[PDB]
Design a protein around this ligand. Structure first.
Ligand code: MG
Ligand code: MG
Ligand code: MG
Ligand code: MG
Ligand code: MG
Ligand code: MG
Ligand code: MG
Ligand code: MG
Ligand code: MG
Ligand code: MG
Ligand code: MG
Ligand code: MG
Ligand code: MG
Ligand code: MG
Ligand code: MG
Ligand code: MG
Ligand code: MG
Ligand code: MG
Ligand code: MG
Ligand code: MG
Ligand code: MG
Length: 148
RNA sequence: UUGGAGAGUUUGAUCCUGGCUCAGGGUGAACGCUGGCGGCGUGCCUAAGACAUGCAAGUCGUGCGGGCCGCGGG
């Protein structure tokens, strides 16, 4: 099993005669703090089901981060629409320096030491997607020598 | 490679653009309430407006001639 954290829980509305009627969403990451994270987005008529629905997707889309002594191997800059995330490798006693969104994403991934920065649209849902697709594009010296 | 966190606010709801605003550190500071000791710094940022009084540049008789006073003694 994994450690699980709810990063976002929001309410949205739609309109029809008689007035507004709501729907809830939850951005949820899940991970072992040992090289495995997954991000899931769940929407439902009530908070709990959405949180649970989210968790199922989180496990449905996962990714394997090549941790090297608790930091990422190389620079990664990634855009997701108008959102940009910078992940920069950091030495031992550094700490995890990121906003509560990529913080929880990287944290549950076993990342213990990292310099980061959000640029552009800091919309919670998009910055999430950009942090993940960044990891999914992380490589190591092995991976490289094998390609080339 | 010793180094980089963001949030609030346009919408019924969304994504984006965009500004406004905030949390930080800093100061020869000032103001309010309050105020026990000590150490080290430090204190007219305005009128280079105006200033009472004292003090801040003198020293040498191993350059010279003197006046006064004194010790000496003619
Ligand atoms: Mg890999
Ligand atoms: Mg772009
Ligand atoms: Mg975006
Ligand atoms: Mg390195
Ligand atoms: Mg912007
Ligand atoms: Mg924003
Ligand atoms: Mg660098
Ligand atoms: Mg910041
Ligand atoms: Mg408003
Ligand atoms: Mg409008
Ligand atoms: Mg409103
Ligand atoms: Mg803004
Ligand atoms: Mg201040
Ligand atoms: Mg005072
Ligand atoms: Mg007083
Ligand atoms: Mg003193
Ligand atoms: Mg002056
Ligand atoms: Mg005048
Ligand atoms: Mg006058
Ligand atoms: Mg004097
Ligand atoms: Mg002489």
């Amino acid at each position: 099993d994994f450690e699980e954290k709810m990063i976002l829980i929001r309410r949205t509305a739609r309109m029809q005669a008689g007035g507004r009627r709501f729907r809830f969403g939850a951005l949820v990451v899940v991970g072992d703090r040992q090289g495995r994270v997954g991000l899931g987005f769940g929407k439902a008529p009530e908070v709990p089901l959405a949180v649970q629905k989210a968790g199922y997707y989180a496990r449905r889309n996962m990714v394997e981060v090549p941790l090297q002594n608790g930091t990422i191997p190389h620079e990664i800059e990634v855009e997701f629409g108008a959102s940009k995330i910078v992940l920069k490798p950091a030495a031992p006693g550094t700490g995890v320096i990121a906003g509560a969104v990529p913080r929880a994403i990287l944290e549950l991934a076993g990342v213990t030491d990292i310099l980061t920065k959000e640029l552009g649209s800091r919309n919670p849902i998009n910055i999430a997607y950009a942090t993940m697709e960044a990891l999914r594009q992380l490589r190591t010296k092995a991976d490289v020598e094998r390609l080339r």
